[PDB]
Design a protein around this ligand. Sequence first.
Ligand SMILES: [N-]=[N+]=NCc1cc(C(=O)NCCCO[C@H]2O[C@H](CO)[C@@H](O)[C@H](O)[C@@H]2O)cc(C(=O)NCCCO[C@H]2O[C@H](CO)[C@@H](O)[C@H](O)[C@@H]2O)c1
Ligand SMILES: [Ca+2]
Ligand SMILES: [Ca+2]
Ligand SMILES: [Mn+2]
Ligand SMILES: [Mn+2]
Lengths: 237, 237
Amino acid sequence: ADTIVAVELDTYPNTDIGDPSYPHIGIDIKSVRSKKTAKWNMQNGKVGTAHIIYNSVDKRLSAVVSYPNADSATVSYDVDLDNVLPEWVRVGLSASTGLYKETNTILSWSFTSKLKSNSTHETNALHFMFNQFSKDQKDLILQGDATTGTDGNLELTRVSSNGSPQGSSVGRALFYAPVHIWESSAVVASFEATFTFLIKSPDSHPADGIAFFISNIDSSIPSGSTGRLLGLFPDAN
Amino acid sequence: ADTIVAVELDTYPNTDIGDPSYPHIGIDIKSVRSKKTAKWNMQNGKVGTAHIIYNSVDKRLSAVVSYPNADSATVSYDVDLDNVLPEWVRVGLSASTGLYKETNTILSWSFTSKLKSNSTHETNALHFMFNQFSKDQKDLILQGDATTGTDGNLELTRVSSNGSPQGSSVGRALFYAPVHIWESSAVVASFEATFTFLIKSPDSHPADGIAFFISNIDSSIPSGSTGRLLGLFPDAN
Ligand SMILES: [N-]=[N+]=NCc1cc(C(=O)NCCCO[C@H]2O[C@H](CO)[C@@H](O)[C@H](O)[C@@H]2O)cc(C(=O)NCCCO[C@H]2O[C@H](CO)[C@@H](O)[C@H](O)[C@@H]2O)c1
Ligand SMILES: [Ca+2]
Ligand SMILES: [Ca+2]
Ligand SMILES: [Mn+2]
Ligand SMILES: [Mn+2]
């Protein structure tokens, strides 16, 4: 059982497991049943941007998702990640499809993490920024159907030669190095993540969504976690 | 209207037309509604083996399907093929997908048929064995989406470049030469069929199955027989 904290861009309402009856962004703490959600006007075919922020002083996890010339969706939740996640973790992106599908394209991804301790200017930091993915992206752990190189983008789920999405696909991309997300002696700990995506669906029923997540270092795709589970959870508990 | 006798490896339960509520192997005499069925623990992603046997003395059609280190499923039915099939027929393999899908890969296929008459030691026989299929398999009649050559296997249904199965696909492969399956003057008539298959599905809902069948010589894929009809029957009567 991995420990998962995630911000989900959920495109398909699975009402039987808690989803609001419309596309939404949500904050998931160890469960696919978002602790908090917000309505999201997902725009089929357009490039969007997501910003996730957190700092140990406020203990507030917030996410903003927007499209150019459009309103943005915000969701924020009070949580002390010290009581939830192990000290070291891996961060990544996840996406899936089920009966319904969509392309889950990542055009760019950046992450920053900082630990400031009880010392004179003694800050530890990690920062990576990808604006172009390559055929052999060695600093990324690709899991499931995830692939890179196609137009310099990261395709989290299966796409056919003619560019059409496929169902029952699940894929993840985790940054290669473990991240020191919190530490008992830290005065302030914080991280920020940003990624631009392109979700396109041939019909009017896209599924299932993309997610930014933080997990235990050795995390892997749970069995049968395609569709509603976003490639993150073993079940809907 | 073709005459069809078949042993089906049904992976998807279509309860509204008779299927038990689980994967099963069954004997179909002129109807998709199996005269007899048996529970089958289909193992996703593994190579299985099917053996079909029949002799005119017992007038018993039996089938055994198994996987290495696993139990096998058996189904047997009393039928006098003389009253059902014409004297000459074609034998083959059929498979399909509907809304749900699976790869329907044949790795090998062999068939033996014998007619022993009231003539001291005068036996007629036909035997063919395929352990490798080639790009141009001239002794096979391919119908629907069926293709050969891909890794030396026979793909009964459509598979995309990246190896993922597709829906609404139907394909058949019939041995080129007509088979003399029975004859009024025969003391004993018998046939045996064996094939190994690989059914793989990306999710947990595989469909629709593979079938070994015997039909009239000029048989072709019934219109709209994808999905539940296994590319064998025009309807669910
Ligand atoms: N598209 N569409 N359509 C209608 C439809 C809708 C739903 C549906 O909207 N479900 C919602 C939850 C999806 O839930 C799934 O998708 C969502 C969204 O991605 C995910 O979030 C979930 O986690 C899950 O993956 C289910 C079924 C269905 O089960 N049909 C069964 C008979 C199919 O009968 C057909 O297929 C059979 C087998 O191949 C054949 O035997 C038969 O002849 C015929 O061809 C059918
Ligand atoms: Ca959902
Ligand atoms: Ca069925
Ligand atoms: Mn949701
Ligand atoms: Mn059946």
